[PDB]
């Protein structure tokens, strides 16, 4: 249905976050999406109505940069090679830029769905 | 009670009677009681209809429940 994650309950307890930081570092290094010069939010599926609407509300600069990044990544994937270690996606630039818009759209849809189902309890 | 009571006050009485509040009921009964003092020749047909419906009508005491006999037959 939708992606799920226990990414907040662990944040509730600081000790669990402190314990799981190195494992998350190693896992993100092992994933290897940064070797293609991409960002994580690019890989999210866009085939429903929510993400299609969200992608049309981004700033123009973000859309153009995303288009260039995707095209360069696919051009590299054509020849089965990666960029040198200098041109890798640094952690500072690997921020979440699509999640808030999707959250806003989902909130709007959920509000409409809530209004849809109502009852009168006298 | 000398002036003729307006027609829009005594029309479609049966439908309105249930919803109509108590005060209007007492007012109408008192007005008709004061009206019937005059000779009945001078009265209109609608006044007679309203008076008879008030007295020998279906509302009030003699308002019995109706049982659907077809329902009883089908249930049996």
């Amino acid at each position: 249905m939708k992606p799920v994650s226990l990414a907040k309950y662990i944040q509730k307890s600081p000790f669990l976050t402190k314990l799981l930081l190195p494992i998350s570092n190693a896992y993100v290094h092992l994933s290897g999406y940064r070797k293609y010069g991409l960002r994580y939010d690019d890989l999210m599926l866009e085939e429903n109505d929510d993400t299609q609407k969200a992608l049309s509300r981004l700033p123009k600069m973000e859309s153009y940069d995303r288009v260039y990044r995707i095209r360069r990544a696919m051009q590299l994937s054509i020849e089965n090679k990666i960029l040198p270690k200098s041109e890798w996606t640094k952690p500072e630039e690997d921020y979440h830029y699509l999640r808030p818009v999707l959250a806003e759209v989902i909130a709007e849809r959920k509000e409409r769905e809530a209004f849809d189902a109502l009852i009168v309890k006298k | 009670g000398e002036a003729m009571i307006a027609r829009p006050r005594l029309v479609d009485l049966d439908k309105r009677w249930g919803i109509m509040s108590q005060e209007e009921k007492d007012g109408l009964i008192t007005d008709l009681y004061a009206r019937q003092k005059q000779p009945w020749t001078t009265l209109s047909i609608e006044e007679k209809k309203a008076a008879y419906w008030i007295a020998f009508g279906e509302h009030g005491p003699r308002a019995f429940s109706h049982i659907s006999q077809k329902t009883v037959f089908w249930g049996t």
Partner: protein
């Protein structure tokens, strides 16, 4: 029947008492097309009303209003921005709270502008542009007054203001000292208390500044193949009862349903074109200006030209010696025509213009009708015809006359 102004907590108020089960609440703001910084800013700012605020989304607002049984309506005019709300008397507090929240805090989301606000404004602009008479009157206003009220109201087809401009204009336009609250429910004290309580956190800004209106004249010509039109416009200073009586004297329509009338313009049309071109006169009072306009409409251009010439001759002859009976009938008709504009709850040009200026308003303005003499009307007419008039012609231009050939 008359709005009595007050001032509670530094907020303009205008109460009225009526024996009805439904109230109203309108916020007249001095943010019309006269004060706009660029083309189409005022229209877009008006369209943003009743959108996502800081406390409830637009969907929530619409659903709540639908559930409560009320109508939310806005209105943009040449010198105001009006936001109304008609409701049953139970929900007065809720509707006052909603209006105060809308005026005070309303976040401007750019995607809302690009999704809903812009297409609706464009559709309204095309709907206005389809009509011919409204375009003619707008062009008459453009030619008469150079700037201020001479600016185009609706959004031009080749303009698109950014969200920042609208946001800053709303920031510097929605302040306590630049609007008023008008209510005409079955209770004034309660409405005044609620309005003072809720319309109180809005900042004490400064009233918007505009230059005094500058009056000029000019003629414009446009082409069309359908019904022909011809309009005359006489700019004048702030409205006076003499102008209203003069407009009612000109008349143009019929008192009874199926007839020709017996006013000056009707007689002119009958004597000129055998009632083949209807002539109608009207007056539009503004804050510090007014426009007495004569509209001659019909299908035959030659009849239009003859009617225009005869009407101008009659208007010129109106300044010689007005018979007393004509003035009496004009006053009698003008009293009714002016009073009839206050019954509707929704404001129009006359009621808004009366309410803006507190010096006279409606208490003494109506009382001055019965003290109009033929000499006053003659003086007003002779003062109107000093400066040249302004014309707007729609249709076959080879027959419609210029001002020099009337």
């Amino acid at each position: 029947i008359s709005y009595t102004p007050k001032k509670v907590e530094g907020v303009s108020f205008a109460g009225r008492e009526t024996p009805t089960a439904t109230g109203s609440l309108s916020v007249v703001i001095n943010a019309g097309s006269r004060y706009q910084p660029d083309a189409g800013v005022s229209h877009l700012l008006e369209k943003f009303a009743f959108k996502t605020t800081e406390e409830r989304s637009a969907l929530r607002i619409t659903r709540e209003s639908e559930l409560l049984g009320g109508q939310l309506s806005t209105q943009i005019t040449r010198e105001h921005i009006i936001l109304t709300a008609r409701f049953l008397n139970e929900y007065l507090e809720y509707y006052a709270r909603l209006l105060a929240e809308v005026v005070d805090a309303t976040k401007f989301l750019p995607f809302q502008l690009t999704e809903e606000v812009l297409p609706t404004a464009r559709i309204e602009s095309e709907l206005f542009r389809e009509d011919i008479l409204r375009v003619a009157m707008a062009k008459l206003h453009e030619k008469a007054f150079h700037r201020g009220i001479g600016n185009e109201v609706y959004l031009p087809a080749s303009a698109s203001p950014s969200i920042s401009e609208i946001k800053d204009f709303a920031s510097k336009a929605y302040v306590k000292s630049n609007f008023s609250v008008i209510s005409s429910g079955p209770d004034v004290q309660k409405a005044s208390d609620l309005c003072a309580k809720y319309f109180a956190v809005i900042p004490d800004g400064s009233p918007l500044k505009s230059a005094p209106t500058k009056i000029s004249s000019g003629e414009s010509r446009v082409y069309s193949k359908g019904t022909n039109y011809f309009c005359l416009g006489f700019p004048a200073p702030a409205a006076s009862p003499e102008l209203f009586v003069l407009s009612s004297i000109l008349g143009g329509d019929a008192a009874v349903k199926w007839s020709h009338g017996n006013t000056l313009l009707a007689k002119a049309a009958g004597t000129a074109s055998e009632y083949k071109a209807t002539a109608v006169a009207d007056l539009t009072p503004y804050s510090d200006a007014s426009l007495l306009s004569v509209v001659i409409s019909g299908s035959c251009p030659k009849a239009i030209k003859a009617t225009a010439s005869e009407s101008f001759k009659a208007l010129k002859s109106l300044s010689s010696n007005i018979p007393n009976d004509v003035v009496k009938s004009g006053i009698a008709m003008a009293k009714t025509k002016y009073l009839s504009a206050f019954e509707p709850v929704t404001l129009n040009a006359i009621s808004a213009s009366s309410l803006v200026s507190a010096s006279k308003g409606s208490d003494a303005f109506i009382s001055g009708f019965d003290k109009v003499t033929p000499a006053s009307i003659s003086k007003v007419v002779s003062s109107l015809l000093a400066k040249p008039a302004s014309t707007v012609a729609v249709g076959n231009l080879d027959v419609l006359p210029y001002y020099d050939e009337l």
